[PDB]
Design a protein around this motif. Structure first.
Motif, short mmCIF file in Angstrom:
data_model
loop_
_atom_site.label_atom_id
_atom_site.label_comp_id
_atom_site.label_asym_id
_atom_site.label_seq_id
_atom_site.Cartn_x
_atom_site.Cartn_y
_atom_site.Cartn_z
N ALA A 1 0.82 -1.20 0.00
CA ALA A 1 0.00 0.00 0.00
C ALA A 1 0.86 1.26 0.00
N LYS A 2 2.04 1.16 0.60
CA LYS A 2 2.96 2.29 0.67
C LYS A 2 2.35 3.44 1.45
N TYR A 3 3.19 4.39 1.85
CA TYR A 3 2.73 5.55 2.61
C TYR A 3 2.29 6.68 1.67
N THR A 4 1.90 7.80 2.26
CA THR A 4 1.46 8.95 1.48
C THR A 4 2.02 10.25 2.05
N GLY A 5 2.46 11.14 1.16
CA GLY A 5 3.01 12.41 1.59
C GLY A 5 3.18 13.39 0.45
N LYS A 6 4.41 13.81 0.20
CA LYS A 6 4.70 14.75 -0.88
C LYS A 6 6.20 14.81 -1.16
N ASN A 12 14.59 16.38 -4.62
CA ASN A 12 13.88 15.13 -4.87
C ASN A 12 13.73 14.32 -3.59
N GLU A 13 13.10 14.92 -2.58
CA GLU A 13 12.89 14.26 -1.30
C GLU A 13 11.40 14.13 -0.99
N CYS A 14 11.01 12.97 -0.48
CA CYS A 14 9.61 12.71 -0.14
C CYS A 14 9.41 12.71 1.37
N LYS A 15 8.48 13.53 1.84
CA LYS A 15 8.19 13.62 3.27
C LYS A 15 6.84 12.97 3.59
N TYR A 16 6.85 11.66 3.78
CA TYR A 16 5.63 10.92 4.09
C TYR A 16 5.47 10.76 5.60
N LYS A 17 4.31 10.25 6.01
CA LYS A 17 4.02 10.04 7.42
C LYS A 17 4.09 8.56 7.78
N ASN A 18 5.06 8.20 8.62
CA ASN A 18 5.23 6.82 9.04
C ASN A 18 3.99 6.31 9.78
N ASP A 23 6.64 13.16 10.44
CA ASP A 23 7.34 13.43 9.18
C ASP A 23 8.38 12.35 8.90
N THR A 24 8.66 12.12 7.62
CA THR A 24 9.63 11.12 7.22
C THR A 24 10.21 11.44 5.84
N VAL A 45 5.80 5.71 -0.65
CA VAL A 45 6.96 4.91 -0.25
C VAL A 45 6.53 3.54 0.25
N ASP A 46 7.19 2.50 -0.27
CA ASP A 46 6.88 1.13 0.12
C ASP A 46 7.85 0.64 1.20
N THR A 47 7.54 0.97 2.45
CA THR A 47 8.38 0.56 3.57
C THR A 47 8.45 -0.96 3.69
N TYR A 48 7.51 -1.64 3.04
CA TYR A 48 7.46 -3.09 3.08
C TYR A 48 8.66 -3.70 2.35
#
Length: 55
Positions: A1-6, A12-18, A23-24, A45-48
């Motif tokens: 499912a991966k995370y969601t952010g921006k 080229n950095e993505c700040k998603y919510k763990n 922030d991440t 991001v696919d933390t899996y």
């Protein structure tokens, strides 16, 4: 499912919510389908499998 952010067109950095809800920042690849084309985009991001996927 991966995370969601921006992502950021700056570095080229993505700040998603763990899973904790914080922030991440995570540098994205340079692929033609996983790079941060523009700023304030949708990145997943696919933390899996430890595999990022920017817009």
């Amino acid at each position: 499912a991966k995370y969601t952010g921006k992502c950021t067109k700056s570095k080229n950095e993505c700040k998603y919510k763990n899973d904790a809800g914080k922030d991440t920042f995570i540098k994205c690849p340079k692929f033609d389908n996983k790079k941060c084309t523009k700023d304030n985009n949708k990145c997943t991001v696919d933390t899996y499998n430890n595999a990022v996927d920017c817009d």
